[PDB]
Amino acid sequence: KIRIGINGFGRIGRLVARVVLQRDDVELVAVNDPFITTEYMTYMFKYDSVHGQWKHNELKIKDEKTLLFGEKPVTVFGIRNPEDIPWAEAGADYVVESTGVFTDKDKAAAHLKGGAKKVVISAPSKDAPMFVVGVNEHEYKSDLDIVSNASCTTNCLAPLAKVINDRFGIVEGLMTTVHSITATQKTVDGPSMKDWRGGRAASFNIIPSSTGAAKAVGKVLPALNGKLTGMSFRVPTVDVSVVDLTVRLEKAATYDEIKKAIKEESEGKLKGILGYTEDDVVSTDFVGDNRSSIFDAKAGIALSDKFVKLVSWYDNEWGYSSRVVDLIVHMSKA
Amino acid sequence: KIRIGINGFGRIGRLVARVVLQRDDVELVAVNDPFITTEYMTYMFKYDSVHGQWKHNELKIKDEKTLLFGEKPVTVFGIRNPEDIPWAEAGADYVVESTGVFTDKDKAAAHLKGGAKKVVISAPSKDAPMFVVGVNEHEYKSDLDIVSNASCTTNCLAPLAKVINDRFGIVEGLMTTVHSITATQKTVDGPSMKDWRGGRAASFNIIPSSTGAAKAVGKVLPALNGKLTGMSFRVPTVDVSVVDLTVRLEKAATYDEIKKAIKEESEGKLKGILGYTEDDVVSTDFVGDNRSSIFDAKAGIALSDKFVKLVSWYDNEWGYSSRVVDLIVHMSKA
Amino acid sequence: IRIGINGFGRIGRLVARVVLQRDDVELVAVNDPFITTEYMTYMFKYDSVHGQWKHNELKIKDEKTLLFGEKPVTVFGIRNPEDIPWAEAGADYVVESTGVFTDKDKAAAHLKGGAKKVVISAPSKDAPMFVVGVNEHEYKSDLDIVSNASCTTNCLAPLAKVINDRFGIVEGLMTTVHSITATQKTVDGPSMKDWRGGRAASFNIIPSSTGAAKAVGKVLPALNGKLTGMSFRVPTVDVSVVDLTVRLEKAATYDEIKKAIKEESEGKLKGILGYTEDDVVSTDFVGDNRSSIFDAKAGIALSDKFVKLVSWYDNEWGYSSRVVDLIVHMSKA
């Protein structure tokens, strides 16, 4: 039923491929990467430095056109531009924009001319519609040709911000995210003309960089629009990131009260999306965590009973790619 | 004139030794480390994985009692407990408490029975007097038997917090410090019974841990006492750390205004202690920076003109050990 | 078979993972004076390399027992060994994983704890050495106390045995590129026993020591004095590789060497010596429970008598799997 093809077998592309491969509501029809060879795709999928080897399927058949995942056959495209890929000729309703270069509303629209019914954008986009599963996936409508699943950081922030606002209200908030390094960085000092500090050696530097993660938590949560901002800090970890959010509350609460409220919501409307822990966890403890956001109770601290600092964890790779397929199923139905 | 002996040839002990070795107002009389051998001390001093090889002096003479720094002779003690070291019998007025185990007011008092006129504690202490050069070293008085130079994080926060408060006033602030790993951490998962997350592998984890850095910025800046708190994040860097401070201001300002005020103070009463940069700097750019705190203009962001997030850098090893000898000279004179 | 672990370190905890998941064996007690029994729950549960645990073990009583499912495991905080009452909770086989008691007589303290047999989680100067799959068969059940050698020995010895057994090695020099361990330092600090071992582990290529190459002969008397080597510690959490440089008595071609190692991979050395022709990397062997895996594509030969062979081992996982494989071989008389 839900036939899928992925555009760009990157970090997110391969990992959301793993997610859809071990589910029964979802299927994998095609993959497009002009840079990866069909024999190379098997190696890239099988071996992972973060999430480990794959326990099910894996094999390539045809000279250079079809791979065998188990006995499900997946189609491979090495096509540079998006409209030139015949997304229908292998059945692909939902295309994952996992490439990172075609982010914008019009730029993902390129897939519909390949014969694709809908496309979901990995990254946030300047104009394409933005949804964070569990906080506003419900304002999706089926006229929508093209969609965006926002960012890892948005997906961790917005569920956590929403319960705080929805039971105590946020007046103003400032966020930092200390974030693992990604494919856009460099091993050693090199050119990254659009972010100068992004060119510096990723694994041996604490890199200040920017993410819009916060104001977007209003572009999808319009109640909090223009109420938050932040920055980032890229630091030498392969995967897993944490959000440090500092907000003042209109309605006074105690740290135990906000803790108990987050536990409440963790087992309610937000179960499996926003989690709760009171353990002495660290970075590694969330590799493979398929939740958008988990709440580090012990980490955070309160100054007033209206001014508090909240800590929450997210696997920027795994949990986010779980969320993209969670979104695709919601639009299937709705 | 200013004769010095250091207790504990650790990271800070050796580095403040380098600082005093290349100054003319200061001298090096003795070093005590029960764990380091006088031949081993030369190796540990000469070769440094962070700050590099040493350009001046270095040689050991006596079988196992005296080292030759240039032609200045330094005395070496391998004594377990503090009062059992004859601090006078080599002329030592000022003893650096660089050990980390004798932090408390009474526990550093142990050096005076060795015949030492004054002792300065590297770390912050529960009761010993606390001074951050450039913000309250002047409230030092010469009755003081024993003193503490506070923490790296305090030394970066308090100068930066003081100009913000002193020209706009801080109502409430929450701070995070993303901090390099230190000697108290473990290479791989091991026992650290007093901080559980501190036992996790330092170089491959983002470790939430606590530092009191903020409320102390009142124990030495009583105008801001009980007005700030924070947490830490230990991440896989050898050296250099940054403070992310989030405060609301009673008196409204614009980001350019606060930038210009920090530049003003950078060249005034705080010159050489609190610095100013508008460059796309990264972690490595402050190794060997001898300032307590440098202000990252471009990094930070403002939400309101009364609610702002400020970013400032500090070399937790080098700048802090520069500050300990800066403090010792102030107490020499005062 | 009842097993108790001394020192819930890296090797101790991971040997606990092994024995808790296999069914021919069970875990009776653990002793660590530096860890509190609740702290063992946290440290066992959470692992930066091998991940969270997918079964369950919890605390029952204030300081004395944990329950994995519903089985005891009594917890000791005893500083020195002859004071550990391995009989009083009935622990027949003891893992000496502390690293401080390598010597035969110093680990003998467990027999006075009322423990019938002792396995050293390390090489020892004066304890019989066995590398499962190459000499585990020379154990005798009179021998009270023993050593399973080192990770590096357990990786080298199968490969050395196969290479010598089919072509004969004249002389060998070995290098291992090795992950950092608990004995290294976060930052430059005192390590008087290894001066380069005190240097910041994660920012350095640190030259270090290994006995493993000399050790091969102590369990493979055919090559005694025919190998020696060195180590290089590098900033990785886990997984290490052996770089072996050998002169061959019998000339062979690299592809022939590949098929010989493949043969033994598939045959009696299965699960001890593996074989791959993949573009493997260190990460690809986290959780690999083999003693040694052979990186075919990596290695190179200069002549048909002079060749360099590359092989992988997870210093944590594979060695601990070998530890309880050895213990069960010793059960079987």
Add this chain to the structure above:
Amino acid sequence: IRIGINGFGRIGRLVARVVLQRDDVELVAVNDPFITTEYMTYMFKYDSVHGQWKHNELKIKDEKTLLFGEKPVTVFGIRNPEDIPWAEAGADYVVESTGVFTDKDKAAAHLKGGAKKVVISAPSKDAPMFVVGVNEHEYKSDLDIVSNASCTTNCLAPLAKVINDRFGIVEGLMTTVHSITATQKTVDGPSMKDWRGGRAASFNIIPSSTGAAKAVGKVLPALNGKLTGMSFRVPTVDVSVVDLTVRLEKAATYDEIKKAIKEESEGKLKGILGYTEDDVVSTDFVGDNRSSIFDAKAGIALSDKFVKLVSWYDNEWGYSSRVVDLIVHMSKA
């Protein structure tokens, strides 16, 4: 002597540091299409390994010149080489540091730029290869375009020359434990030319390729076909080590080998081959400008004809020092 650099990368910028601080040479122009001339100021000024610069170089005019003190350096953003007017700002000697133009004919594009001589910041398939201190003397001033070989070659060849020159090496196998470079990846990504090179560089021991061992013979025809080897990339910013395994024609003892290398250290190989008996570590060679330094204490011999020798090199700094050492040797006819 006027020098211009093509590609302000790691090697390009650091060769710029060298030529800007020495006085027998000067720096005339730089070309990089991916860097804007203000961006060169930022990237040259700030370095994660070698630190900030202690002199000064700034921008003068919108895109065309920088001033180090008050000397020009004109800046080019030209994609392909024959379009770089090395004559029009008068740059006689060109550093080809881009890494894409190794081939003799492809770097010949600078002679059409009006440049009299070209030095390849790398090995090349079809360009004469020189390792300063071992064969720099065979340059002829008719040869228009050239290569300085690789960091690994420049470290191995002095040590191989000394060892062979006094004891003769029969066969050699080499390993290098090497820092990561710009060609590796932050996270697992496409590198179809080296499949293991795309894997996350900083979390892996990555087996990789080297021609340096075969290359030694191309500049040391005595040992042609007597050495070969492999590499291991490990998560460090800079500094690498060679692990050399040799068979000796003339039997020697390790201490004798130590004093022979010490002799050459002190003598004609001074500043190219260094010698230490210290507990050195990788960090200790950041900024070390020698081709090769000999870690005496590290290495080990099996017999007096079979020995393993360890030597250090800063792949960035020492190689770039060698680059302009070569250029000035070529000035001198």
